[PDB]
Amino acid sequence: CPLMVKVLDAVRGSPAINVAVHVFRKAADDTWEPFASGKTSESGELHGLTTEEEFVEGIYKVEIDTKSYWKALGISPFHEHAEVVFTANDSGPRRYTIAALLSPYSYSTTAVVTN
Amino acid sequence: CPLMVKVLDAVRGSPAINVAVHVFRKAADDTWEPFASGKTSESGELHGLTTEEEFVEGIYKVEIDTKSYWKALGISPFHEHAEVVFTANDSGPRRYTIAALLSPYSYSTTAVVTNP
Amino acid sequence: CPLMVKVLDAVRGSPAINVAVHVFRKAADDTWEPFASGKTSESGELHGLTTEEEFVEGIYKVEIDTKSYWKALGISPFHEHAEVVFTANDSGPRRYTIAALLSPYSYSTTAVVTNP
Amino acid sequence: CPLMVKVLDAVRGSPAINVAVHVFRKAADDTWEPFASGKTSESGELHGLTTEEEFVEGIYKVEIDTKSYWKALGISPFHEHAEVVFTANDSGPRRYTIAALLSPYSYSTTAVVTN
Ligand SMILES: *B(O)c1ccc(/C=C/c2cccc(B(O)O)c2)c(Cl)c1
Ligand SMILES: *B(O)c1ccc(/C=C/c2cccc(B(O)O)c2)c(Cl)c1
């Protein structure tokens, strides 16, 4: 698990369950090609998106469908989705956790990058 | 205005209006003495808490009554309040904005510190 | 001023000054068309991006160039930028403030939406 | 583990390691009595603070010594510490994770409350 995504709900104080997540890698023509996707688990987590062989250096975009998550809960959301765009850098063995904390009109995201 | 408090609502996408704020200052005997208090306005801002003369070096606690705020909107929030504790003016007088972004089970706070 | 962007620095406790901001609008062919751009001022605010006439219903993307900002301070940040994507004015014209609080490996964003 | 504390570093993108955490419970005279404490692990986590028998309903304060954490890294911090004050409510079996994401002039905290 070179790449994990974790999503939390700031309104209900819970994991954000069954949230669609799409990962894209930037191509040479500078467009976003699908790379991996899934739905978050009961623990708000999404594992097994990629493997260390496939997860090469490059720019990646993690898109979290926050709008559908809120809509299914009956709450009026602001954002179309939440997007996290970052460079994967090989300099040193790294595991990446992309965490997002969601509110209807706000979100915050952080990266936890470890050996 | 050496100390201003700004409060936003992350559920409604609006200023957080009518939020009670209490400020304390740590006294010599190490207890929290009441220093100033007020209510955020329609813009979510609380001005006029203190003056440059009164706002001396010290350790201050800004306690924002988040629970009352959420309860009136029908939500039973996690936190009793949000408190922000910091040393002020120890390198000379500064202007401090204490900003908070509120959700029922979460909040964020940041400080903007400027030199007049 | 129907659209304003405000950017704060969580490491320095200050406005984030000289941050490039690019705004796009989703066109009919579903591509992102350049809509407006600018630089945050000394107060971390970016005013004057658009007008009530120009700022029609649509899906907008506000892209904040966080990486350039951190790089100039010597920090190699995690994110390429912060992007904020939202439908605007679909219930009539509103005023939008897009606020962001920046750290090298993290950021938060919130929207304040008011009705004039 | 009825109560867990997790602390992350937003500047370095890592767990906040070896951070002192103090938990207090509010007493009848409305003063804060020490309840539990520890230092965060290598994963920025602090487990085993209490047990379900001891963790009764009441108001608790979690104090995170953020100032010492930043000082030991050579970074000038704003806050004296970060404090999280909440009511533990029995209505339903609950596990509490108090998470905090730290910057030198800012922090955010959320509660993840699950069965
Ligand atoms: B939590 O991660 C968080 C707290 C606070 C803010 C916003 C602060 C703000 C917004 C508009 C104006 C001012 B001011 O200096 O008058 C401050 C965010 Cl985005 C996130
Ligand atoms: B502030 O706006 C903020 C606070 C906390 C988080 C996420 C915390 C987290 C990350 C990974 C795992 C767990 B856990 O419950 O084991 C919690 C963010 Cl993104 C932002």
Side-chain angles (χ1 to χ4, degrees):
Chain A
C1 239
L3 178 64
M4 197 263 286
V5 175
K6 182 159 179 93
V7 186
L8 303 165
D9 180 327
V11 168
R12 291 189 305 164
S14 68
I17 298 172
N18 212 35
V19 184
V21 178
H22 294 261
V23 188
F24 303 84
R25 187 174 186 269
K26 208 175 197 179
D29 64 8
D30 266 343
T31 72
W32 296 109
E33 18 183 284
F35 178 78
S37 54
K39 307 271 291 179
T40 54
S41 68
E42 218 193 320
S43 71
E45 286 171 26
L46 174 55
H47 299 273
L49 288 166
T50 191
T51 63
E52 36 189 19
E53 242 292 12
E54 319 181 44
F55 197 45
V56 294
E57 285 186 316
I59 303 171
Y60 292 81
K61 176 160 74 164
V62 175
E63 170 176 305
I64 305 168
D65 187 11
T66 58
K67 194 186 190 183
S68 302
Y69 174 78
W70 292 119
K71 281 174 78 187
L73 291 176
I75 292 158
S76 176
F78 176 75
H79 304 93
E80 284 297 298
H81 45 64
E83 289 192 289
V84 178
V85 182
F86 64 96
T87 299
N89 171 252
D90 264 353
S91 301
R94 302 312 217 149
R95 288 180 300 147
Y96 295 77
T97 298
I98 303 295
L101 172 64
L102 312 182
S103 298
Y105 278 67
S106 176
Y107 63 85
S108 71
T109 182
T110 191
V112 186
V113 185
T114 54
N115 236 53
Chain B
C1 222
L3 176 58
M4 190 268 278
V5 179
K6 178 148 190 163
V7 189
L8 300 182
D9 183 326
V11 167
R12 297 154 111 196
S14 66
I17 301 156
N18 243 264
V19 178
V21 178
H22 296 253
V23 187
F24 306 80
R25 183 186 176 274
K26 204 148 214 172
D29 58 6
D30 227 50
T31 72
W32 288 112
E33 293 182 336
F35 178 79
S37 65
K39 249 192 196 163
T40 57
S41 68
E42 289 178 10
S43 64
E45 305 188 1
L46 170 47
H47 298 269
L49 280 171
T50 190
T51 66
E52 182 171 90
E53 245 174 50
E54 177 182 73
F55 189 44
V56 296
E57 261 189 284
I59 298 180
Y60 291 82
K61 171 162 64 169
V62 175
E63 162 193 292
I64 303 171
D65 176 15
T66 57
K67 183 184 195 177
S68 295
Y69 178 80
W70 289 117
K71 274 197 47 180
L73 306 192
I75 297 103
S76 299
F78 184 69
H79 304 92
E80 291 299 297
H81 48 244
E83 56 183 295
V84 178
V85 182
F86 63 99
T87 302
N89 304 307
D90 53 307
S91 313
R94 300 288 188 274
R95 307 296 182 249
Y96 298 82
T97 293
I98 304 302
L101 172 63
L102 304 187
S103 303
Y105 273 71
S106 178
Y107 60 90
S108 163
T109 184
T110 194
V112 183
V113 184
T114 67
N115 189 338
Chain C
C1 222
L3 176 58
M4 190 268 278
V5 179
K6 178 148 190 163
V7 189
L8 300 182
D9 183 326
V11 167
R12 297 154 111 196
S14 66
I17 301 156
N18 243 264
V19 178
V21 178
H22 296 253
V23 187
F24 306 80
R25 183 186 176 274
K26 204 148 214 172
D29 58 6
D30 227 50
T31 72
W32 288 112
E33 293 182 336
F35 178 79
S37 65
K39 249 192 196 163
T40 57
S41 68
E42 289 178 10
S43 64
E45 305 188 1
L46 170 47
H47 298 269
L49 280 171
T50 190
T51 66
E52 182 171 90
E53 245 174 50
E54 177 182 73
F55 189 44
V56 296
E57 261 189 284
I59 298 180
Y60 291 82
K61 171 162 64 169
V62 175
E63 162 193 292
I64 303 171
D65 176 15
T66 57
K67 183 184 195 177
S68 295
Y69 178 80
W70 289 117
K71 274 197 47 180
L73 306 192
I75 297 103
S76 299
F78 184 69
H79 304 92
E80 291 299 297
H81 48 244
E83 56 183 295
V84 178
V85 182
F86 63 99
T87 302
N89 304 307
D90 53 307
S91 313
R94 300 288 188 274
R95 307 296 182 249
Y96 298 82
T97 293
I98 304 302
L101 172 63
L102 304 187
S103 303
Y105 273 71
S106 178
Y107 60 90
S108 163
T109 184
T110 194
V112 183
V113 184
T114 67
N115 189 338
Chain D
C1 239
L3 178 64
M4 197 263 286
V5 175
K6 182 159 179 93
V7 186
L8 303 165
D9 180 327
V11 168
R12 291 189 305 164
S14 68
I17 298 172
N18 212 35
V19 184
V21 178
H22 294 261
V23 188
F24 303 84
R25 187 174 186 269
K26 208 175 197 179
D29 64 8
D30 266 343
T31 72
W32 296 109
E33 18 183 284
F35 178 78
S37 54
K39 307 271 291 179
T40 54
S41 68
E42 218 193 320
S43 71
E45 286 171 26
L46 174 55
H47 299 273
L49 288 166
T50 191
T51 63
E52 36 189 19
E53 242 292 12
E54 319 181 44
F55 197 45
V56 294
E57 285 186 316
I59 303 171
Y60 292 81
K61 176 160 74 164
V62 175
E63 170 176 305
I64 305 168
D65 187 11
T66 58
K67 194 186 190 183
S68 302
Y69 174 78
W70 292 119
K71 281 174 78 187
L73 291 176
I75 292 158
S76 176
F78 176 75
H79 304 93
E80 284 297 298
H81 45 64
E83 289 192 289
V84 178
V85 182
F86 64 96
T87 299
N89 171 252
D90 264 353
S91 301
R94 302 312 217 149
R95 288 180 300 147
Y96 295 77
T97 298
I98 303 295
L101 172 64
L102 312 182
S103 298
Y105 278 67
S106 176
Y107 63 85
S108 71
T109 182
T110 191
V112 186
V113 185
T114 54
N115 236 53

